[PDB]
């Protein structure tokens, strides 16, 4: 209360070992296991990992009471722990709540680590019973959206889709409601599942009743990749991983600045004439929310951020073209953008 | 270009004593200089620094480039360099560019440390010469703007107008433009500078011309407090010192969230009918840019911030009190918010 919030030095970050990994796991809500290889003899590689568990052990100060807690199992000092703890993906978080492990492949800062973590900490199923609750749904615009319509909490089919909902939290929300007044307004029936992917106003209703747990994964699976993705820094490693042959058309727009506010929606209107285009992966990048790789960027790709920009990136060659754009010049339309998306098949 | 970001381990920030500093200082554009007393010694406070110093190596790693120094000054190893560089407030960072010096006193996290520092190699003047750009000052709403109509850059009343935007870079932005036609559109002649407090939409206008360096400073003097104030992470401290007696309104709002969207426009109108009343700071903290602090607040205050929330906050009593709410029932009024004022002025 009075103490003002600051990093205490306390170490908190559990050496985790054959001895302690069952207490430790019975004792935390959600254990966050930093599985790493031993740090190399030089001076660098030391400080690289002394940051690793520091970003960590600031983590491990915000969310003592909230129950989590965080470990370093070593790929060789603990490789038995690894070994039956099922750790494969070296140098990597892992998240343990409950029986679903979660990789966790997002940006290596004590923010995201934390906002992620605290999402890990709610439940799957976010019910809704109000209009104010049923007009926070219809404002969900950059991510993967799931709503399923049913008749009550205990029901059978609403107990598989919360086992449904554990294998993909919290990266896609998934929301459930009891009301048949609400279940007009999003053109739900009972036990009816509709599907909104990314920045597409009209959805896509998915097969009526009965679906399985092991029926609702795999249209996700087929479907989890948007046509246009929001980089997100809690996933922005597997989203970078899944490109189009090595291709990834990559939009550099704030979210804030009115340049880009329109920018926002010219982009998102192209998504929505091609998303009959399963290649077609767009990735918007908000600068506003990547504070540290912004002079890289416009060093790497000759740039400058403060005015919106788009290209093509080459993950293969590591290649990029980038449109030649006037400030002064009205911001380039819809069909501007496919006519400079011609020069992408040629080659 | 090919390397992918990550912290190399490679240590910047240099030991500044009473050899070097002349050196340093003629090396970098911008220097970033953390005031520090010598670490206790013990674990925990060795660990605190630990993470200050590589808070600030992170920083040093990303603005290598853009030319921005950084360097520990001790309180008593560096003694002397400290009383010559006007080193007072121990424990803080100092911010050298050209002569002006900034006493940093936001977040020390490795995100606000560049953004603040991106800003400061800016030029302090940000000139419009189109629509596109006009419609970006148009859209400034969580600061207090100012915007300045000069015949020339070269003009010497606009010469005195740069050298009064550096005693306030970059906390506050400095606008200039040089056409007539949209000195039309801001109702500001020639020479005629209008000051804009933040979230008020009529502004307010400052003597004619001329205008002196010693002018322009003493007019923000008596108005860098807005009636309502974002709680920006760059200078979250200065604000949270510039109380009213003690008291601060502060107000849990997310400006993503419908629920929030709508507090946050029946908060600007409640300022819009009292910035009459010089005694009243309310503070507007946006939870999704100070993640590390959420699980703080909803124990500290015993609230749930998914939820938006108000109440008044004593500094001098540490104490609190908040407007209890039903997330069901309809968002409360401005008229409630004032008639819930009135059991502020009761004690
Ligand atoms: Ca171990
Ligand atoms: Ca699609
Ligand atoms: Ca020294
Ligand atoms: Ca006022």
Same mark, same amino acid.
């Given at each position: 209360?009075?103490?003002?919030?600051?990093?205490?030095?306390?170490?908190?970050?559990?050496?985790?070992?054959?001895?302690?990994? &069952?207490?430790?796991?019975? &004792?935390?809500?959600?254990?966050?296991?930093?599985?790493?290889?031993?740090?190399?003899?030089?001076?660098?590689?030391?400080?690289?990992?002394?940051?690793?568990?520091?970003?960590?052990?600031?983590?491990?100060?915000?969310?003592?009471?909230?129950?989590?807690?965080?470990?370093?199992?070593?790929?060789? &000092?603990?490789?038995?722990?690894?070994?039956?703890?099922?750790?494969?993906?070296?140098?990597?978080?892992?998240?343990?709540?409950?029986?679903?492990?979660?990789?966790?492949?997002?940006?290596?800062?004590?923010?995201?680590?934390?906002?992620?973590?605290?999402?890990?900490?709610?439940?799957?199923?976010?019910?809704?019973?109000?209009?104010?609750?049923?007009?926070?749904?219809?404002?969900?615009?950059?991510?993967?959206?799931?709503?399923?319509?049913?008749?009550?909490?205990?029901?059978?089919?609403?107990?598989?889709?919360?086992?449904?909902?554990?294998?993909?939290?919290?990266?896609?929300?998934?929301?459930?409601?009891?009301?048949?007044?609400?279940?007009?307004?999003?053109?739900?029936?009972?036990?009816?599942?509709?599907?909104?992917?990314?920045?597409?106003?009209?959805?896509?209703?998915?097969?009526? &009743?009965?679906?399985?747990?092991?029926?609702?994964?795999?249209?996700? *699976?087929?479907?989890?990749?948007?046509?246009?993705?929001?980089?997100?820094? *809690?996933?922005?490693?597997?989203?970078?991983?899944?490109?189009?042959?090595?291709?990834?058309?990559?939009?550099?727009?704030?979210?804030? +600045?009115?340049?880009?506010? *329109?920018?926002?929606?010219?982009?998102?209107?192209?998504?929505?004439?091609?998303? *009959?285009?399963?290649?077609?992966?767009?990735?918007?990048?908000?600068?506003?929310?990547?504070?540290?790789?912004?002079?890289?960027?416009?060093?790497?790709?000759?740039?400058?951020?403060?005015?919106?920009?788009?290209?093509?990136?080459?993950?293969?060659?590591?290649?990029?073209?980038?449109?030649?754009? +006037?400030?002064?010049?009205?911001?380039?339309?819809?069909?501007?953008?496919?006519?400079?998306?011609?020069?992408?098949?040629?080659?």
């Amino acid at each position: 209360g009075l103490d003002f919030p600051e990093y205490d030095g306390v170490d908190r970050v559990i050496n985790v070992n054959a001895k302690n990994y &069952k207490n430790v796991f019975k &004792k935390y809500e959600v254990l966050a296991l930093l599985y790493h290889e031993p740090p190399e003899d030089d001076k660098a590689s030391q400080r690289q990992f002394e940051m690793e568990e520091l970003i960590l052990e600031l983590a491990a100060q915000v969310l003592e009471d909230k129950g989590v807690g965080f470990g370093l199992v070593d790929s060789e &000092k603990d490789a038995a722990v690894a070994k039956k703890l099922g750790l494969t993906e070296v140098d990597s978080m892992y998240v343990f709540k409950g029986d679903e492990v979660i990789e966790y492949d997002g940006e290596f800062s004590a923010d995201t680590i934390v906002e992620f973590l605290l999402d890990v900490l709610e439940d799957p199923v976010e019910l809704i019973e109000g209009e104010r609750e049923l007009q926070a749904f219809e404002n969900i615009e950059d991510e993967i959206k799931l709503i399923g319509y049913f008749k009550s909490k205990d029901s059978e089919h609403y107990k598989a889709f919360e086992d449904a909902a554990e294998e993909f939290h919290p990266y896609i929300p998934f929301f459930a409601t009891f009301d048949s007044k609400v279940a007009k307004k999003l053109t739900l029936k009972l036990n009816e599942i509709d599907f909104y992917e990314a920045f597409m106003e009209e959805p896509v209703t998915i097969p009526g &009743k009965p679906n399985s747990e092991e029926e609702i994964v795999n249209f996700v *699976e087929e479907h989890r990749r948007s046509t246009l993705r929001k980089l997100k820094p *809690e996933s922005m490693y597997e989203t970078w991983e899944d490109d189009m042959d090595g291709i990834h058309i990559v939009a550099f727009a704030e979210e804030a +600045d009115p340049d880009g506010f *329109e920018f926002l929606e010219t982009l998102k209107a192209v998504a929505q004439d091609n998303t *009959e285009n399963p290649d077609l992966s767009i990735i918007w990048i908000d600068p506003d929310d990547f504070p540290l790789l912004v002079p890289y960027w416009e060093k790497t790709f000759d740039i400058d951020l403060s005015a919106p920009q788009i290209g093509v990136v080459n993950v293969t060659d590591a290649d990029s073209v980038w449109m030649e754009m +006037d400030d002064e010049e009205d911001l380039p339309s819809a069909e501007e953008l496919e006519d400079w998306l011609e020069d992408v098949l040629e080659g």
